[PDB]
Design a protein around this ligand. Structure first.
Ligand code: 6MD
Length: 149
């Protein structure tokens, strides 16, 4: 058995959706990310209120890909004023640090039975960018990702 996540009360987990595989590769390479304005604000608020007493995890998936592609931890607050045009499209304003934990493809079939009570009970696999995941469901997703071979 694996009881590691048991007793973790302090943790917040978000879905990250990307239209670009290039941005995923760049994120892995340089340990940085950027979301939408409203996505950034959501993530920044979670990171800042965590106050270092627990992790903010990010579950990454490319739109239309059929799989999640990995997990990173948010590792800084959002800097809203940074170099433009670093990503595939020039829509993004700002940057924050991340540390990647899993770089592995996990099919949606492996995760589609976990549903989110805060998103109308929809499969976690039908989430939008910066959808937050309740902690108990997040623990379930993490364990499946970690154990997928
Ligand atoms: C660098 N960051 C990013 N790169 C590519 N696509 C992103 C992104 N952040 C969000 N998205 C996607 O683009 C949409 C916003 O235009 C979001 O709902 C996501 O699906």
């Amino acid at each position: 058995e694996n009881l590691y996540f048991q007793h973790m009360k302090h943790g917040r987990v978000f879905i990250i959706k990307s239209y670009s595989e290039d941005d995923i590769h760049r994120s892995i390479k340089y340990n940085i990310w950027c979301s939408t304005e409203h996505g950034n604000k959501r993530l920044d608020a979670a990171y800042r209120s965590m106050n270092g007493k627990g992790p903010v995890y990010l579950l990454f998936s490319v739109n239309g890909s059929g799989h999640f592609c990995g997990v990173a931890e948010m590792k800084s607050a959002v800097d809203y004023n940074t170099c433009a045009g670093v990503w595939s499209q020039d829509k993004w304003k700002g940057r924050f640090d991340v540390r990647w934990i899993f770089v592995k493809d996990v099919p949606n079939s492996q995760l589609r039975h976990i549903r989110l009570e805060n998103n109308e009970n929809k499969p976690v696999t039908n989430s939008r960018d910066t959808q937050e995941v309740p902690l108990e469901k997040a623990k379930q997703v993490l364990k499946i990702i970690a154990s997928y071979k």
